[PDB]
Amino acid sequence: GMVNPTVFFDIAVDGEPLGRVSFELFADKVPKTAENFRALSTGEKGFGYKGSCFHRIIPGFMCQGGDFTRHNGTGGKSIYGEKFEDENFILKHTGPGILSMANAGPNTNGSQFFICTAKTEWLDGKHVVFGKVKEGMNIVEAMERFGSRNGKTSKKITIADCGQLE
C-alpha cells in the first residue's frame, strides 16, 4: 500500500526544549482522520499544531492537545471546514502511545486529540484511534510531570515545532 505517514512534534516546557515525539498515522485504516492530523502537523493548510499546547494532561491517563484556534481547550478546527464524522472504530485503545481523537460527542471531530499513557479500553467505539507513538514515548511520560488530576497543566507544554518525516 501507500506508506503510512510519520509525523513529529518537538515539545517544549515554558519554552525550554524537552524532546521529540514521532507518530505513525494509520492512514491505511482511517485515511480522513490521519490526513487531518498530518496536514495540521505540517502547517500546509496555513494553520495547524505548531505553537499550540497540550492543555489537559492527566497522569496515568492521557495528554490532550490540538486547540490551535482559541488556545484554551474549546477550539481547534479540522481541515474540512466543519467538524467531521467518526470515520470508523476499527482500531482500539490498546496501551500507552495510542493517538486518538477527542470529541464533544458522536461525529464531532475537529483537531483535538490525545496520547494515551495507559490502556483505555473504555474509550473503544467512542474515540477514533488513528495513530501511535513511534519514538519518544519517554517524552510523553515526561510531559505527565506537568499534569494534574483535573488535567490543568503546571507549565506551558507546547508543540514548538512539528512536521512530516520523510
Place this chain on the structure above:
Amino acid sequence: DPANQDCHVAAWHCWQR
C-alpha cells in the same frame, strides 16, 4: 463554534467508579 471536547475525560471518570 467552541465545543467542550472532553467526553473521554467523563468516560474515564465513569470507569473510575
